[PDB]
From a paper:
Here, we report the crystal structure and biochemical characterization of a feruloyl esterase (LbFAE) from [name], a LAB strain that has been used as a silage additive. The LbFAE monomer structure includes 260 amino acids that forms the canonical α/β-hydrolase superfamily fold with a conserved Ser-His-Asp catalytic triad. The protein forms a homodimer with two-fold symmetry where the active sites from the two monomers are oriented facing each other. The two subunits associate to restrict access to the active site such that only single FA chains attached to arabinoxylan can be accommodated, an arrangement that excludes access to FA cross-links between arabinoxylan chains.
Wild-type crystals soaked with substrates were also screened, but only FA (i.e., the product) resulted in a complex with LbFAE. When viewed down the entrance, aromatic side chains are observed to line the entrance opening such that Phe207-Phe38-Phe169-Tyr169-Phe46 from each monomer together form an oval, almost closed collar. Moreover, FA O1 can hydrogen bond to the backbone amide group of Phe38, and FA O2 can form an ionic bond with His233 Nε2. Additionally, the O4 hydroxyl group of the cinnamoyl ring offers a hydrogen bond to Glu146 Oε1. Hydrophobic interactions with the cinnamoyl ring of FA involves Phe143 Cα and Cβ, and Gln154 Cγ, and the C10 atom of the methoxy substituent which engages in a CH/π interaction with the nearby Phe38 ring. Docking of arabinofuranosyl-ferulate in the LbFAE structure highlights the restricted active site and lends further support to our hypothesis that LbFAE is specific for single FA side chains in arabinoxylan.
Author numbering:
A (entry chain A), B (entry chain B): -3 to 259
C-alpha cells in the first residue's frame, strides 16, 4: 500500500519544458485513478489565486481522484517568455498535456476530465471540442470567453487599451510584457463553434459578481447537449470569499464524483 | 559538466512538508554556489506575483548565483491550513530554512543571503537578526512592516476590519480562512529590535506607489549600520509595471553581485 502523495512533474512540448504538480490518492502499487487535469487563467499560475487549485486538488485527492495541474508555457515556472505567448500555443499545449498526462503511471486514461478557471476554461472548452472523444467530463469556472470581443471590438484588455501595441511593441500586463504575436494570433481563435463539438457532461459555475458578462455562459449552454449551469449568488471571478470558496469546491467535487466515481 | 537546471525541493519543519524550487547555475559536478533564499509575502506563493520571484531566480541563476524559494507553511503547495497560520511559525520556518538550504549539495554555506518581498521582507529582517552570522547580505523589497501597527492600533488588515473575527470565527482573506491563532500570536512579534541585530550589508528597495507607508523603511534604516535605501520613483508594492520590474531585477542583481560575487 501507499499513502497519498504530492509530486512534481515535467513535460516537454514543442521546445518548452512545462512544469506541474500531481496529487495522487492513496492506493496500492501501480493503481490507476480517475484524473482531473486543471487549466489556470491568463497570466496566472498552476496554484491559481489564493490556493484555489491547491484546495481543489487536495479535495479530489482525498476522494480517490488524482489532480494534475501544469503552468502553461510562458506562465509560472514553465519555460517561455510572456512576450512570446499566444493563445494558439496555449491550446496546443492543452492538447499535448492531455496526451502527456494520460500516459502517466497513476492515470486511468478512460476516466479523465478537464477543469478550467477563467481563460483556462476557455482553453479547456476549445480543447474539449477538438478532442471530443478524449474527455469523460468538463467543468468550467468563470469562463473568460469575452476576451476576443473585448480586445477586437472594444480595443481593451481587462479595461486597458491595446491600441499602442503596434507602435510600442508590447502590452504591459502587471509588469509582464505581452507581445504583438499574442494580438496577431487572436484572428485564429474560435471559441463557440469549437466548444459545441463536445457532447459529454459539462458543468459551468458562474458567480453573479464576475466581471465577465453572464451572457457568455448562456452561449456555452446553448451549444452543449449535456450542460449544467450553476449560478452562485455573490460569487466572484476568483472565488475570493470564504462562502463562495466553499461553494465552488463543493459544487466541483459533486460533479466529478458523479462523472468519474459513480458513472 | 552540467548545464543550469530547475529542480523541486522539499523539507520537513515542525511536522509540515514545505515545498520549493531551486534554480542551479551551470557548473562542475558537486560545485557549491553562492545562494539567495527568497521569502514570499502574506498569503502569496513562492512564484510571487506575476512571475516576480521566477524572473529574479533566473536572473541570479544565469549569473552564477543559486536561487531557492519555498512556500511557507500554510501557503502555496506546502502543508498546513491558512486557519492555523501564525507569524511565529513563519519566523521559525524561515530560520529552519537556512539550514535546510545550506544542507543542499549545490549551496555554499559561507556565501548565503536572504531576499524578501513584502511580509517576507519582515520575516527576513527578523530571521537575519536572530541568525546574523549565517547571512552574507540581506535584501528587502517593499517591507510590509506596518502590519502590527495596522492590525493592533487601527484594527484593520489591508484596510478590512479585524473586529468581526470572534463573531465570524475567522478573518476572510480572499477566500482563505485566517484564524484566531494568527491574531493571538501578534503580541509575540518584535520587528525592529530583532532587525537591528543584523549588521551586515542590507539593501531596501521601496516604490513610491507602495501602499505601505515609507516611514517603515526609514525606521529600518535607523537601526542598520550598513544599510542602503533605494526609492524607486513610481515603483509599486509588487513591481507590477514593466519599468519597475526591470528596475527591481537590476537593482537586486547589482546588490547580490556586489555582496556574493565581488566580495
Ligand atoms: C486576455 O484578455 C482578457 C482576459 C480576461 C480574463 C482572463 C483570466 O482571468 O484568465 C478577461 C478579458 C480579457 O480581454
Ligand atoms: C522579460 O521579462 C521582463 C523584462 C524586463 C526588462 C527587460 C530589459 O532588460 O530590457 C521588464 C519586464 C519584464 O516582464
Ligand atoms: C497581515 O497583515 C498585513 C499584511 C500586509 C502585506 C503583506 C504582504 O504584502 O506580504 C499589509 C498590512 C497588513 O496589516
Ligand atoms: C480550508 O479553507 C477554506 C474552507 C472553506 C470551507 C470549507 C467547508 O466548510 O466545506 C472555505 C474557504 C476556505 O479557504
Ligand atoms: Ca527537518
Ligand atoms: Ca507531509
Amino acid at each position: 500500500y501507499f499513502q497519498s502523495m504530492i509530486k512534481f512533474v515535467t513535460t516537454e512540448i514543442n521546445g518548452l519544458t512545462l512544469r506541474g504538480t500531481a496529487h495522487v490518492p492513496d492506493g496500492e502499487p501501480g493503481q490507476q485513478f480517475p484524473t482531473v487535469l486543471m487549466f489556470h487563467g491568463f497570466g496566472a499560475v498552476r496554484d491559481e489565486g489564493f490556493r484555489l487549485f491547491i484546495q481543489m486538488s487536495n479535495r479530489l485527492m482525498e476522494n480517490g481522484i488524482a489532480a494534475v495541474r501544469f503552468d502553461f508555457g510562458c506562465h509560472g515556472e514553465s519555460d517561455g517568455e510572456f512576450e512570446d505567448f499566444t493563445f494558439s500555443q496555449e491550446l496546443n499545449e492543452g492538447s499535448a498535456l492531455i496526451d502527456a498526462v494520460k500516459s502517466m503511471s497513476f492515470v486511468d486514461s478512460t476516466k479523465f476530465s478537464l477543469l478550467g478557471e477563467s481563460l483556462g476554461s476557455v482553453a479547456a472548452s476549445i480543447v474539449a471540442g477538438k478532442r471530443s472523444t478524449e474527455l469523460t467530463s468538463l467543468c468550467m469556472w468563470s469562463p473568460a470567453a469575452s476576451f476576443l470581443d473585448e480586445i477586437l471590438n472594444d480595443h481593451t484588455l481587462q479595461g486597458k487599451t491595446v491600441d499602442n501595441v503596434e507602435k510600442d511593441g508590447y502590452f504591459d500586463f502587471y509588469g509582464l510584457k505581452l507581445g504583438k504575436a499574442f494580438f496577431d494570433d487572436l484572428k485564429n481563435i474560435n471559441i463557440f463553434d469549437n466548444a459545441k463539438k463536445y457532447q459529454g457532461p459539462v458543468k459551468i459555475v458562474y458567480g453573479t459578481n464576475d466581471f465577465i458578462p453572464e451572457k457568455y455562459s448562456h452561449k456555452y449552454m446553448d451549444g452543449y447537449e449535456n450542460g449544467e449551469l450553476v449560478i452562485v449568488q455573490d460569487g466572484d471571478h476568483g472565488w475570493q470569499s470564504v462562502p463562495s470558496r466553499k461553494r465552488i469546491l463543493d459544487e466541483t467535487m459533486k460533479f466529478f464524483r458523479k462523472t468519474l466515481l459513480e458513472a
